[PDB]
Each structure stands twice: as C-alpha cells, then as structure tokens.
Subunit: 240 residues, 3 copies
Amino acid sequence: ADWKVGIQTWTFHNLTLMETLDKTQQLGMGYAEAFFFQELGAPFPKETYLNYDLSDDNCALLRHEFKIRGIKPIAFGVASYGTNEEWDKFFAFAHKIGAHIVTVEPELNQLDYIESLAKKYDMEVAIHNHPASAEVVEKALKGRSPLMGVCADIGHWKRVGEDPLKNLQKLSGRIKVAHLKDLTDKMEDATWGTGILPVKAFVNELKRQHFNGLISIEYDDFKSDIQEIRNSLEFLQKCS
Amino acid sequence: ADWKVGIQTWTFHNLTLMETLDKTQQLGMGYAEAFFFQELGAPFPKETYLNYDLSDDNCALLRHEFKIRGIKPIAFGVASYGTNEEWDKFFAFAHKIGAHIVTVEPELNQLDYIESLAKKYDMEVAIHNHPASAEVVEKALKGRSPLMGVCADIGHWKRVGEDPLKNLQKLSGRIKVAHLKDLTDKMEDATWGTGILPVKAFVNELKRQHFNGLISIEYDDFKSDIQEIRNSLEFLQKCS
Amino acid sequence: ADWKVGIQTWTFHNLTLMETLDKTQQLGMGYAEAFFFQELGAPFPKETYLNYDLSDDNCALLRHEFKIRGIKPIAFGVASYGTNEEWDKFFAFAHKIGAHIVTVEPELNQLDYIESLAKKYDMEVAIHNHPASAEVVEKALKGRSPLMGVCADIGHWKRVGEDPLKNLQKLSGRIKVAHLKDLTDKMEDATWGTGILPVKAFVNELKRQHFNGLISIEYDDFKSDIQEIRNSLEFLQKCS
C-alpha cells in the first residue's frame, strides 16, 4: 500500500541469484535490489553472472525468472562506476530488465551525466553518499529532476537524536530507497530508544513521514534464519 | 573480589533470555547486562519480551529466574530514550528487578533529568557516548552525583597510544562499566601490542587502575564457543 | 612472478597455527602473515602459542613445519608495541624464523628506533596507520631507508574516487604489503564500480602500478569456504 518492501540480494551473495530469489519467496517479499557479479544459476548456464553485458536472450530469461516467482526486479545497485560508458550500459541494462530504480554512489561531477541517463530511460536514481553529509545531498539535488533522489541508510535504529528518518528535513519526498542493514528480529538492538517494539516504532515513523519508496532490507543470513526475519517483515509489510 | 565480570545478553539475542541465562551458567558468570525486547521464554508465556511494561507478577518471576541460576540482573542497557516518560519507566523497572546499574546513551540536555532519576531510585548510571569525545564526558559529569558515571568501550586491545583504559584520566573512579565487544580467546587480535597474553596484560591494567566496576562482555556466539570464551573468562575472573 | 599472495592467519584464529597452515595448503598459497598468541598445535606441546619468546628448538621446529608445507613465514604482524624491548624481541624473532617483512602500527616517535632494527636485521617494515592520513605516512617515510614501507589496506573495492591503490601517489614503490580484508568470491561487493569482474580489475591495477609486494588476504571463514576463495585466488595468483 504505502511503501514497498524488498530484499538486497547481497544478503545471499554466497548463493546464486536464482537461489536468492527462492529464498526471497520463502521470506514472502515481492521486490529485489540486485548487486552485480552474482552467479545467476540454472536455468542460466554455469559461470554466467549478473552484469550489464547479458545477451537479449538472457535478459528475457532473467525477466521471466523474476516474473514466475512473483518478484519484481525493481532495483539494481549499488553502482559506483568511474566512466560514462559504464553508466550508460548500466542504465540501459536496468531499463532492459525493467527496473524502476537504481541505487548509485557517484562523484558530484558525474551527477549531470547521470541525470541525463535517468531522463533518457525514465529511471529513478537513489544516491548513496560515501559511508557535511546531509547538506551536500540537498545542495547537489536542488533543482534537479524528481527522478534524482536519495538512498537513505537506516543505521542503528533507534538512538536519541540520531534518527536517520528525521534527517529527511527538506528532501523528504526525494527519499526513494531506505537501506536496512543487518536486520534483526523485531529490529531489536543492543542499544534501543523506543518504549514499543522497535520495528513498530520504525513503521510508525515511516507512516508519519509518508514514506512511499522502497525499503530494501539486508541481513546476516548466517546469524539469522527465515522465520526470525519473517517476524520483522510482518510489521514492515502488513502496515502497507 | 576487585571487579565484576558479566555478560551482555546481546551475545545470545537469537535465543530467549532464559536460554541466554542458561548459557551464562555454562560460561560461569554471575552477572548480566540485559537488552530489551528479547523474548523471555519459558516459564514466561510465548510472545512476552523484556521491557519496562512487565507486570508485577512477571517482574517477580524474572527476579526468581535470575536468582535460581546464581546470576544477578545487575544492569540493563543500552537505553537511548527520547522522552522523560520512557526514562522514568526504565529506571522504575530497573529498580523493581533489582538492577544496580543502567547503561545509557542520552543527549546532554537529558542528563539533569536522568540524574534526578538516579538519585530517586539509587541507581548508578553508566553513560555511553555516541560511537571532543573524552573532554565532553568529563565536562558533562563534573559536579554531578557519584551515581553518574561512564560506560567505557574497550575497542581493539591493545594498540600503542590507543589504550582505552589510559584515557580514564581524571574520571578514573567514575568508570562504572567496561564493554568488551567481540571477545576472543585470550583477547588475541590481528593487531597486538603486548609481550604477554593480551588478556593477562588487560587484567594487569585493570588492577593498576583499581577498576572495581563491571566488565560486561559480548562475543560473536556464531564464531566462538563456550570453551574458547572460558579461556578468557579464566583470567578476567580469577584475578578477582 | 610479479607479486606474492599470502594468507593472514587471523582468518583461522579459531584454529591452531598448524591447522591454519593445513588450510593454507588447501587454499593453494605459499606465504603467510602470522599474528601472535595463536596456539601452535601438534607437533608443538599443548598451550604453546606464537610469540617472540619461543625457544631455539621451537623456532627450528616452526621453520621446519612451514617448510614441509611449502609455505614461507614471510611476515609477522600487526605489531603495535609500546616499548623498545618488545620491538627488539619482535624483530629478533622475525629474523630467527626467517620472515622478510613485519607489519606494524607504531607511533611516529618509535619510527627512528624501528628503522634501526630494520637495518640491524635486514627486515622490511610495512607501516599500518590507525584505522591527514596519506600525507603523514609520506612525510614520515621521506628520507628513511627503503626497508621502511607501507602496509596498505584495500577497503571496499571498488568505488569511484575512493581507489586505495590510486592513493599510492609518490610512495608507490614503498608499498610493501596490501591487506585484503573480508575477501569475497571474485571480489564481489554490495557496491561495485567495474564493468569487468572486480578481482580482474583489481589485478589489472596492480599490474599497472607494478605492485611487487605481498597481497595478504583475510576472509571470514565462517561465511566463506575454500572453494569460494579459490575462485578469487585464481586471478590473484595466475596473473603472477
């Protein structure tokens, strides 16, 4: 309803992408943010990896493989390329596979060129700065197309006065993607700052800020299991 | 004797608190620093988690469950609340369960209110700053009640000139809790700075600084086992 | 041929050093950078650990144990000692075991003394600064013996404008060791910045900069297996 909940395929980077999508089905999510150079896996032939050089046949097969699992290949990233050729090929590929967003970590001088590509392919762009910070992204984005947005990192939720969502300030509306790293059961943490379940408080804040972008989750798949993460996904999804 | 050695229950956050306390028994420790929102586990009913809203009956049961295992619920934290109501409820709960310390990560404007609660409940407070640093805590604490102290993080022990214990400076005496994160066998590390076993050198420094607070240990329970950690606990405990 | 590829024994710090060397054989590497206080393991007696106090007999046995596995004990580190006695003993030990390099994290005032030891034992020194940065190492090293070099950390390869190799600048030639932390399959990462396999691009850059030092790799042995790492080692080694 309000926002989308997807998985960062990096979560399962030790698996093939097809296996990752099978896990995504077991988690009960309908969206993915895929990182490049993951082995695709059957039905793709061995040693074929995710990259913008995939043949038209393999691009069509990749689209089909997402579709039959009920998962949209909504995003690719994080891309941090150094040449215009790479950016061009990356945006063309994203468009060809049918992504609606790309997450990117560019230099400031690359933004002009990247914006032209966003327009050319009707691709939304969520900029991730290098992990002074909040001021630069707002200053850089001011006056640029609405396609040019922000990939916001949700750090360690929640600590008093370090609320990543409350930093949205003047660009709350340009926030297109939220990265949840190391998602835990009910967003529990060694440090907490909420009277209610942290994941409930998190969802409430997203509602209050009318976030309608993509919540892209990552977790440590060696330290957590599908059942544990499904506890958190419950609140992240059933609100929407 | 000199100091206390306890566990951070975050170590086993993938388990229930009762299971965590069973592990704490196998480790041979008599103290715990508990984080909120962990499932309690039997004898508590399913879906009951650690938080300051526990009924008087459940508070009494929690006290009993610690006591029969020979473990004191000495600390709760790290709390980083944003409202006075939350702080009030947290300190009341700590007192009700019989904690002697709480670890906290507040803003500077909250210290006055937090100090009033420390006095009101005779609760000691170990302040953890956001992970300029050493100066602020000393300046903030100067002239405040002896209950207002510091939760010191022991980073990567030991590197020349970056000794966290030697930073104690003028507030060595206000150091109430030391957090050991990612405890390894004999405190071995990829970088070392001692001629003797690092854990032996660490213990010696604690003796030299007359540390008599709580050493609160955390480790990666997926990368280490009880036997390995018991090697380090040996020196941390048998000195005292 | 061009450079050496070795393992950081920290990778397997949960094992004995002998077991670590067995794993190093299974990986197919001929060099090691060993951290101190690891249990040695059979044929050494129980509770004997790696440190500069090993008897001449045990030093000779350690040399033999490396040799029969086809692995050179090329480096020890990272050492971050606080006294001259410790440094002296560490360099003497490195020489006695037949290391050609030591990785170290000293204060600036210790460099003079450390350089004297490097000369005295013909030991190369790779300085690792505390993890303003690039300027200090160049300024500190200027005019010092060619034995005094740099241990460079390869962070998260590869992001545009944050290329650790391109920072080599004026001291490319004093770079003696490159630390690869958390090595992944084909150096894949959640953020990428290359059109080709990241490990291929990495190797190409090392060739272009004529790096001929030691690539010292570490990985998470709980999250990766020998087969996965052998995929990356393939390109790191077969280029040379």
